[PDB]
């Protein structure tokens, strides 16, 4: 089937429905090819999302909705939220309230760098299998324990880049290699990026890591002259709407549910 999407849908309708196999998925939107019901993000297949859109398209709201979807699908022992918000976006991650779920929220660039590096080096790197092990030894290793870590990164274009005099690494760069290997350490990065400059957007290292990780990418409002791939062009769209594009090339028009 292929139905047309409403102007708006409440995220609470989406959550109450998913609630009612061996699922490892969250849902924060409805889809044209899902009979206007929830579109599950299968986290074993696509452990995160890259979200690309022009101003006003609903990048920030989508992360709020994803946060709320996480909290309704998982207990705090199963999932923790790390909130990265360099623009202190109005009505954004700063207002997502959940004690027990939020292990860190930061907006200051050095603070963000600290939070991401601590998570990557103290928590996630240990979950990787040690180097210099036989494949036989690797197959019998104990799996890591603890919660899955959902890192919500708004406005990656506003993260401070690498510099010299004084030397500083790009803010949050510690996470990039673990994002490629995210399926092994239970890391789930949902990052948004302004995409008015379609031509630099592929050079953004956050986009590179997510593409290299082969996560799905959500193309919200964009210039229809721009091409997602040989077969799919970007679309101009109202807020909350986007083209969900899998690494396999599958494409769905979706509508992000409006958060509580
Ligand atoms: N899922 C949605 N459904 C309906 N309307 C939405 C949705 N998300 C956002 N909007 C509308 O779009 C407006 C801007 O949303 P938001 O601030 O999330 O966009 P943004 O892309 O993060 O903006 P910016 O590019 O300025 O950071 C909201 O105030 C709301 O009016
Ligand atoms: Mg925003």
Residue numbers in the entry: 1129 to 1148, 1152 to 1391
Provide passages from the article that reported this PDB entry.
EccC, the motor subunit of T7SS, is essential to assemble a stable membrane complex for the secretion process. It contains a two-pass transmembrane domain, an unknown function domain (DUF), and three Fts-SpoIIIE-like ATPase domains (ATPase1, ATPase2, and ATPase3). In this study, we have provided high-resolution crystal structures of ATPase3 domains of EccC proteins from Mtb, all in complex with ATP. In our structures, ATP and a magnesium ion bind to the nucleotide-binding site in a similar manner.
To explain structure-function differences amongst EccC-ATPase3 domains, the crystal structures of Mtb ATPase3 from ESX-2, -3, -5 were determined at 2.20 Å, 1.97 Å and 2.00 Å resolution, respectively. Though the sequence identities are only 20%~30% amongst the four ATPase3 domains, their atomic structures can be superimposed and have r.m.s.d. values in the range 0.99~2.02 Å by comparing Cɑ atom pairs. Here, our structural data showed that the recognition pocket in each EccC-ATPase3 is different. The signal binding pocket of MtEccC3-ATPase3 is much wider than MtEccCb1-ATPase3; the pocket of MtEccC5-ATPase3 is much flatter while MtEccC2-ATPase3 has a shallow recognition pocket. The different shapes and compositions of signal recognition pockets further imply that different T7SS subtypes could specifically recognize individual substrates.
